[PDB]
């Protein structure tokens, strides 16, 4: 649960938001294949 716990503290930084948005779009392409 360490991954989830750290996320709220430092979501402000832009780099972190940009990275997360890229990860989410990758999952969306996976759903598209299915």
């Amino acid at each position: 649960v360490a991954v989830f716990q750290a996320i709220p503290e430092i979501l402000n930084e832009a780099i972190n938001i940009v990275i997360i948005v890229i990860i989410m779009f990758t999952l969306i392409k996976g759903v598209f294949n299915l």
Partner: protein, 178 residues
């Protein structure tokens, strides 16, 4: 912390510049927090102790100098002062703590932590006699710029997020494999 003595530089104009710059940004002074091997930071500790002794010891002037006996290693590095004294007595160019040169990059805007302008034979050394140090400090500026950028990214980017990025590329390759 760098400023141990003064507790609750630019405002008090500790530094004099011939270049028309009036102050250094807080990060420039922070660059001395863990730097005990540079005499510019030692002079910063001395000025901080001076502010603290002006504030807390304004009553008696006798104590303000009766406390500096056997307690200088608390404020400044003994090693640097004794190295300066030994180099002076041996004739080696030494740091007399007066002139400090720092490389200001005009375009990128970054500057280096001021280093001591070594003095030999009663005259400041010519630029041509420490230009190797200047080149080393320029290479250090570039390398430490990139290193500090990496350090800050590591400080404020979840490494687990990076591993999730790696696994995301992995299963995206798995997906397009089909």
């Amino acid at each position: 912390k760098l400023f141990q003595w003064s507790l609750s530089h630019c405002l008090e104009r500790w530094l004099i510049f011939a270049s028309d710059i009036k102050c250094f940004d807080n990060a420039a002074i922070a660059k001395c927090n863990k730097e005990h091997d540079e005499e510019f930071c030692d002079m910063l500790r001395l000025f901080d102790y001076n502010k603290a002794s002006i504030a807390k010891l304004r009553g008696e002037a006798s104590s303000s100098i009766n406390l500096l006996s056997g307690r200088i290693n608390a404020i400044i590095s003994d090693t640097l002062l004794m190295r300066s004294s030994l180099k002076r007595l041996m004739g080696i160019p030494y740091c007399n703590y007066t002139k400090f040169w720092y490389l200001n990059h005009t375009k990128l805007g970054i500057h280096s932590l001021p280093r001591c302008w070594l003095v030999s034979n009663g005259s400041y050394l010519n630029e041509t006699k420490f230009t190797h140090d200047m080149e080393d400090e320029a290479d250090k500026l570039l390398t430490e710029m990139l290193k500090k950028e990496y350090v800050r990214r590591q400080e404020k980017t979840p490494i687990t997020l990076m591993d999730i990025l790696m696994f995301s590329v992995s299963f995206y390759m798995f997906s397009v494999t089909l």
